[PDB]
Amino acid sequence: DFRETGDSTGIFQIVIEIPESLSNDKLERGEEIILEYTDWGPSGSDYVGDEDEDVNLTIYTS
Amino acid sequence: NSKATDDAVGSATTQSLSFGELGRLLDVTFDDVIWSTPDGANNTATGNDSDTCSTELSNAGITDTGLGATGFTLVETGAATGVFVGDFQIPSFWCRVSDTTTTPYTYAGDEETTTGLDIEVNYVDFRDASGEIVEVGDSAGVRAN
């Protein structure tokens, strides 16, 4: 799972292998993939809980 | 055969935790699958013919049925060198693990050649430079002529 890149960085890294078949269904070439993280406690929120903001990343199979 | 750390370098005593299995320190895989001997209760699959994978290997004269059967050990080079070395010999055939989520593992019904498959070793450091748990590895290719 996620781990910091040093004692005081606030930056977390993970190494993921692109799957062949997630749920016995194989990925296609050029397939749209979305990565979604829900930051419970955005700039908007006053306490952790409360509002949420979604941050997205899009990646492609070649 | 009653523990999740079978045919791996580690301890029979074990527990299931977030990072993985606590009794596992090193193992060897062909095509990203644990290299294990077909033994236990879930080795009854015969495959295409009526011969189980365990007797299927025996007819080929193979005694290196898995990592546990080669006598592989990690031995420290010196008394306090901190470098560990082990060795073994690549077999002609091996028996693939069908399902790793059961104990004992469920083995396929037919032996497969090792040629054209990658070989990998995986080491789990309980304590990295930060004192946390990480896994590292190396890979290589088995070839034929």
Task: Draw up the topology in text.
The structure is cut from a larger assembly and holds two copies of chain A.
Chain A: E1 3-4, E2 12-13, E3 32-38, E4 54-60
Antiparallel strand pairs in A: 1-2, 3-4
Disulfide bonds (chain B): 53-95
PDB class: structural protein
Keywords: Nmar_1547 S-layer, structural protein
* Order of adjacent strands in the largest pleated sheet of chain A: 1-2
β-sheet strand percentage of chain A: 25-35%
SSE class of chain A: mainly beta
Shape of chain A from CA axes? Answer: extended
Biggest sheet of chain A, in brief?
Answer: 2 strands, antiparallel
The helix tally of chain A amounts to 0
Terminal CA distance of chain A: 26 Å
Oligomeric state of the chains present here: part of a larger assembly
Q: For the CA atoms, what is the radius of gyration of chain A?
A: 16 Å
- Write the H/E string of chain A, N to C: EEEE
Biggest interface pair, residues each? A-B, 3 and 4 residues
DSSP, total strands of chain A: 4
Helix content of chain A: under 10%
